[PDB]
Amino acid sequence: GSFTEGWVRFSPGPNAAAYLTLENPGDLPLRLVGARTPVAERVELHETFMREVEGKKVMGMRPVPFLEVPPKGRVELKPGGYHFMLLGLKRPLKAGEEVELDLLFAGGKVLKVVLPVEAR
Ligand SMILES: [Cu+]
């Protein structure tokens, strides 16, 4: 509580990406394995990283099976790394809009967030 928040990324095209702050209020660990949203057909769960090829340093991205958050702790889907990919959007979405995410937590759980959309 503070921020604790996120934003969905601008795109008028077929796909987008989403960044957000995961926080665990429980005494047991939470584990984010999936998601949902009213502005996609697929969600996918991704990482992002720095990488070397030929001694020349670039960035890259991959899908991943889940994220972990320890009890009383927090971890963001940060723009310098982990994020959802949203594909098959239902608003062509843009700076100053408004979007839900649903976050599928391991063993019978879910969290809902509401995020703004940003040209970020
Ligand atoms: Cu991605």
mmCIF file of C-alpha atoms and ligand atoms in Angstrom:
data_model
loop_
_atom_site.group_PDB
_atom_site.id
_atom_site.type_symbol
_atom_site.label_atom_id
_atom_site.label_comp_id
_atom_site.label_asym_id
_atom_site.label_seq_id
_atom_site.Cartn_x
_atom_site.Cartn_y
_atom_site.Cartn_z
ATOM 1 C CA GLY A 1 0.000 0.000 0.000
ATOM 2 C CA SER A 2 1.509 3.225 -1.456
ATOM 3 C CA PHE A 3 2.257 2.191 -5.083
ATOM 4 C CA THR A 4 1.385 -0.921 -5.209
ATOM 5 C CA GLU A 5 0.269 0.145 -8.707
ATOM 6 C CA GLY A 6 0.932 -0.410 -12.454
ATOM 7 C CA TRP A 7 0.120 0.770 -15.995
ATOM 8 C CA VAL A 8 -0.873 -0.958 -19.272
ATOM 9 C CA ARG A 9 1.309 0.000 -22.279
ATOM 10 C CA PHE A 10 0.032 2.059 -25.257
ATOM 11 C CA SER A 11 -0.662 0.343 -28.607
ATOM 12 C CA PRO A 12 -3.251 0.859 -31.430
ATOM 13 C CA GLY A 13 -1.860 -2.437 -32.933
ATOM 14 C CA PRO A 14 -2.671 -6.153 -32.289
ATOM 15 C CA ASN A 15 -0.591 -6.397 -29.057
ATOM 16 C CA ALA A 16 0.578 -4.554 -25.891
ATOM 17 C CA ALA A 17 2.358 -5.285 -22.515
ATOM 18 C CA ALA A 18 1.557 -4.566 -18.790
ATOM 19 C CA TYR A 19 3.696 -3.563 -15.761
ATOM 20 C CA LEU A 20 2.442 -3.631 -12.080
ATOM 21 C CA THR A 21 3.417 -3.920 -8.385
ATOM 22 C CA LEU A 22 2.664 -7.319 -6.783
ATOM 23 C CA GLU A 23 2.435 -7.251 -2.937
ATOM 24 C CA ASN A 24 1.712 -10.245 -0.615
ATOM 25 C CA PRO A 25 -0.313 -9.436 2.581
ATOM 26 C CA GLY A 26 -0.321 -13.116 3.733
ATOM 27 C CA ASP A 27 1.902 -15.228 5.981
ATOM 28 C CA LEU A 28 2.326 -17.789 3.146
ATOM 29 C CA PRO A 29 3.917 -17.162 -0.322
ATOM 30 C CA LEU A 30 1.893 -16.052 -3.366
ATOM 31 C CA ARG A 31 2.642 -17.268 -6.843
ATOM 32 C CA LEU A 32 1.491 -15.580 -10.051
ATOM 33 C CA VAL A 33 1.125 -18.273 -12.782
ATOM 34 C CA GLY A 34 -1.389 -16.560 -15.161
ATOM 35 C CA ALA A 35 -3.560 -13.495 -15.837
ATOM 36 C CA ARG A 36 -6.715 -12.093 -17.503
ATOM 37 C CA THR A 37 -7.916 -8.635 -18.749
ATOM 38 C CA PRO A 38 -10.876 -7.181 -20.763
ATOM 39 C CA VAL A 39 -8.375 -5.813 -23.384
ATOM 40 C CA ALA A 40 -6.789 -9.054 -24.736
ATOM 41 C CA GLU A 41 -7.481 -12.529 -26.299
ATOM 42 C CA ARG A 42 -4.130 -13.936 -25.049
ATOM 43 C CA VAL A 43 -2.263 -12.933 -22.014
ATOM 44 C CA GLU A 44 1.318 -14.301 -21.796
ATOM 45 C CA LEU A 45 3.725 -14.022 -18.816
ATOM 46 C CA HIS A 46 7.213 -12.716 -19.763
ATOM 47 C CA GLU A 47 10.644 -11.713 -18.445
ATOM 48 C CA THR A 48 13.070 -9.094 -19.938
ATOM 49 C CA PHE A 49 16.885 -8.999 -19.638
ATOM 50 C CA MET A 50 20.283 -7.723 -20.841
ATOM 51 C CA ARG A 51 22.321 -10.067 -23.144
ATOM 52 C CA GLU A 52 25.658 -10.197 -24.996
ATOM 53 C CA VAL A 53 26.258 -11.377 -28.609
ATOM 54 C CA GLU A 54 29.791 -10.932 -30.193
ATOM 55 C CA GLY A 55 30.761 -8.841 -27.062
ATOM 56 C CA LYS A 56 27.975 -6.400 -28.164
ATOM 57 C CA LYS A 57 25.337 -5.887 -25.459
ATOM 58 C CA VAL A 58 21.596 -5.907 -26.345
ATOM 59 C CA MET A 59 18.276 -6.609 -24.513
ATOM 60 C CA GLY A 60 15.848 -9.573 -24.854
ATOM 61 C CA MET A 61 12.549 -11.102 -23.653
ATOM 62 C CA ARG A 62 11.117 -14.610 -23.087
ATOM 63 C CA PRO A 63 7.936 -16.215 -21.667
ATOM 64 C CA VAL A 64 8.232 -17.671 -18.106
ATOM 65 C CA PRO A 65 6.109 -20.245 -16.139
ATOM 66 C CA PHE A 66 5.337 -18.043 -13.063
ATOM 67 C CA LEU A 67 6.512 -15.311 -10.662
ATOM 68 C CA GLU A 68 6.895 -15.716 -6.867
ATOM 69 C CA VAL A 69 6.170 -13.229 -4.038
ATOM 70 C CA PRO A 70 7.243 -14.089 -0.410
ATOM 71 C CA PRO A 71 4.887 -13.429 2.595
ATOM 72 C CA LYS A 72 4.586 -9.743 3.697
ATOM 73 C CA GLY A 73 6.934 -8.985 0.714
ATOM 74 C CA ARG A 74 6.554 -7.453 -2.774
ATOM 75 C CA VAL A 75 7.891 -7.796 -6.373
ATOM 76 C CA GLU A 76 6.855 -5.634 -9.367
ATOM 77 C CA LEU A 77 6.301 -6.684 -12.925
ATOM 78 C CA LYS A 78 8.774 -3.827 -13.630
ATOM 79 C CA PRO A 79 9.546 -2.288 -17.108
ATOM 80 C CA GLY A 80 13.258 -3.228 -16.631
ATOM 81 C CA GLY A 81 12.147 -6.936 -16.563
ATOM 82 C CA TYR A 82 9.033 -9.011 -15.811
ATOM 83 C CA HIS A 83 5.710 -8.144 -17.476
ATOM 84 C CA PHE A 84 2.524 -9.550 -19.048
ATOM 85 C CA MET A 85 2.216 -9.487 -22.864
ATOM 86 C CA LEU A 86 -1.355 -8.695 -23.993
ATOM 87 C CA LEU A 87 -2.353 -9.848 -27.536
ATOM 88 C CA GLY A 88 -5.722 -9.490 -29.371
ATOM 89 C CA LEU A 89 -6.737 -6.220 -27.596
ATOM 90 C CA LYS A 90 -10.334 -5.019 -27.257
ATOM 91 C CA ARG A 91 -9.583 -1.286 -26.816
ATOM 92 C CA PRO A 92 -6.925 0.141 -29.195
ATOM 93 C CA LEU A 93 -5.312 1.579 -26.095
ATOM 94 C CA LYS A 94 -3.570 4.794 -25.475
ATOM 95 C CA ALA A 95 -2.280 7.438 -23.039
ATOM 96 C CA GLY A 96 -4.869 8.281 -20.356
ATOM 97 C CA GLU A 97 -7.089 5.131 -20.647
ATOM 98 C CA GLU A 98 -8.090 2.651 -17.948
ATOM 99 C CA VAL A 99 -7.750 -1.190 -17.871
ATOM 100 C CA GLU A 100 -8.343 -4.110 -15.463
ATOM 101 C CA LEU A 101 -5.921 -6.949 -14.831
ATOM 102 C CA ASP A 102 -6.839 -10.261 -13.149
ATOM 103 C CA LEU A 103 -3.770 -12.139 -11.714
ATOM 104 C CA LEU A 104 -4.009 -15.947 -11.420
ATOM 105 C CA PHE A 105 -2.393 -17.053 -8.123
ATOM 106 C CA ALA A 106 -1.421 -20.723 -7.457
ATOM 107 C CA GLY A 107 -4.006 -22.949 -5.684
ATOM 108 C CA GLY A 108 -7.521 -21.434 -5.943
ATOM 109 C CA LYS A 109 -6.593 -17.690 -5.767
ATOM 110 C CA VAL A 110 -6.847 -14.469 -7.811
ATOM 111 C CA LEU A 111 -6.118 -10.723 -7.412
ATOM 112 C CA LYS A 112 -7.862 -7.858 -9.324
ATOM 113 C CA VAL A 113 -6.087 -4.518 -10.144
ATOM 114 C CA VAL A 114 -7.231 -1.437 -12.130
ATOM 115 C CA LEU A 115 -4.395 0.345 -13.994
ATOM 116 C CA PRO A 116 -4.199 3.464 -16.267
ATOM 117 C CA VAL A 117 -2.835 3.190 -19.863
ATOM 118 C CA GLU A 118 0.436 5.068 -20.689
ATOM 119 C CA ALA A 119 2.729 5.836 -23.715
ATOM 120 C CA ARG A 120 5.602 4.144 -21.834
HETATM 121 CU CU CU B 1 6.749 -9.257 -23.647
#
